[PDB]
Structure 1
Amino acid sequence: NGIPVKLLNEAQGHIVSLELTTGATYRGKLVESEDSMNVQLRDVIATEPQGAVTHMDQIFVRGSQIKFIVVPDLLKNAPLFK
Structure 2
Amino acid sequence: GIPVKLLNEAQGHIVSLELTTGATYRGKLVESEDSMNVQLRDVIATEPQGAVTHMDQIFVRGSQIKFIVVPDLLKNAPLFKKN
Q: CA deviation at 1:52?
A: 1.1
Deviations 1:19-69 (A, max 9, x none): 011110010111111111011100011101211101001000111011110
Deviations 1:63-82 (A, max 9, x none): 10111100010101221216
Please list every run of 5 or more consecutive structure 1 residues that lacks an aligned counterpart in the other structure: none
Q: Distance in 1 between matches of 2:37 and 2:43?
A: 16
Q: Distance in 1 between matches of 2:49 and 2:43?
A: 18
Q: Indicate the percent of aligned positions where both proteins have the same amino acid.
A: 99
Q: Distance in 1 between matches of 2:16 and 2:25?
A: 6
Q: Distance in 2 between matches of 1:15 and 1:43?
A: 10
- Count the aligned residue pairs: 81
Instruction: For residue 80 of structure 1, give the secondary structure of its aligned residue in structure 2.
Output: helix
Q: CA deviation at 1:13?
A: 0.3
Please list every run of 5 or more consecutive structure 2 residues that lacks an aligned counterpart in the other structure: none
TM-score normalised per structure 1: 0.93
Name the structure where helix makes up a greater proportion of residues: 2
